[PDB]
Paper text:
F17 and F18 fimbriae are wire-like structures expressed on the surface of enterotoxigenic and septicemic Escherichia coli (ETEC) strains that secrete toxins causing diarrhea in infantile livestock. F17, F18 and type-1 fimbriae are assembled by the chaperone/usher biogenesis pathway and comprise a few thousand copies of a major pilin (F17A, FedA and FimA respectively), several minor pilin proteins and a single two-domain adhesin (TDA) at the tip (F17G, FedF and FimH, respectively). The N-terminal domain of TDAs is a lectin domain, also called receptor-binding domain, because it mediates adherence of fimbriated bacteria to glycoconjugate receptors on host epithelial linings. Amino acid sequence and crystal structure analyses of the lectin domains of F17G, FedF and FimH elucidate a previously unacknowledged basis for strain-dependent glycan binding profiles of E. coli fimbrial adhesins, one that is driven by electrostatic interactions.
Residue numbers in the entry: 1 to 175
Write the structure that this text describes.
């Protein structure tokens, strides 16, 4: 059995985040290592119980502009892109996103005969695609994509809301 307990619209990263690097940025594309700082995380999005089995599918709506080590680079602007992970509650469980179709980002699990929750996480890392007369790049709030729950092994959603969305909070790149 399943119930929805989280938020439909979700913001990724702190509002007006500031990100900077000492690294050279002469070998483009360059990826800021923002760790898990630019992310959303919530352990309690659906409440599940009684043998219910569920996983997660993810979908990124941004345009693919390249790839880096087996995952897509998504374009925000002509000079700024994103590496995106989606998956289970833990950021370390994040699945490297590629393409614009629904992809399994959490194989799943089943609750025993007790009550628990299904959570999720999303985090991105900024990528410098091309140089710019600024050195300070500014990105506005942008829609990213969605995550839906994936009931499996007989379990069903019914009319319970399955899908939640994500928006990138505006930030600034420095140095
Ligand atoms: C230890 O108690 C419960 O055990 C189950 C099964 O291992 C699971 O760990 C529970 O945590 C949930 O795990 C889900 C998948 O890993 C995750 O989506 C949920 O966010 C977790 N819910 C939590 C931590 O409250 C855990 O309750
Ligand atoms: Ni290095
Ligand atoms: Ni829905």
């Amino acid at each position: 059995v399943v119930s929805f307990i989280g938020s439909t619209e979700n913001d990724v990263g702190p509002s007006q985040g500031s990100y900077s690097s000492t690294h050279a940025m002469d070998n483009l594309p360059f990826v800021y290592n923002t760790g898990y700082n630019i992310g959303y995380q919530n352990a309690n999005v659906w409440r599940i119980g009684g043998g219910f089995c569920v996983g997660l599918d993810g979908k990124v709506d941004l345009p693919v502009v390249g790839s880096l080590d087996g995952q897509s680079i998504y374009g925000l602007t002509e000079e700024v892109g994103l590496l995106i992970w989606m998956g289970d509650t833990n950021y370390s469980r994040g699945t490297a996103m590629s393409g614009n179709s629904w992809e399994n980002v959490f194989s799943g699990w089943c609750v025993g005969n007790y009550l628990s929750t299904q959570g999720l996480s999303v985090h991105v890392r900024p990528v410098i695609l091309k140089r710019n007369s600024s050195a300070q790049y500014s990105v506005q709030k942008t829609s990213i994509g969605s995550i839906r729950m994936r009931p499996y092994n007989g379990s069903s959603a019914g009319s319970v809301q399955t899908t939640v969305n994500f928006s990138l909070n505006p930030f600034t790149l420095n140095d």
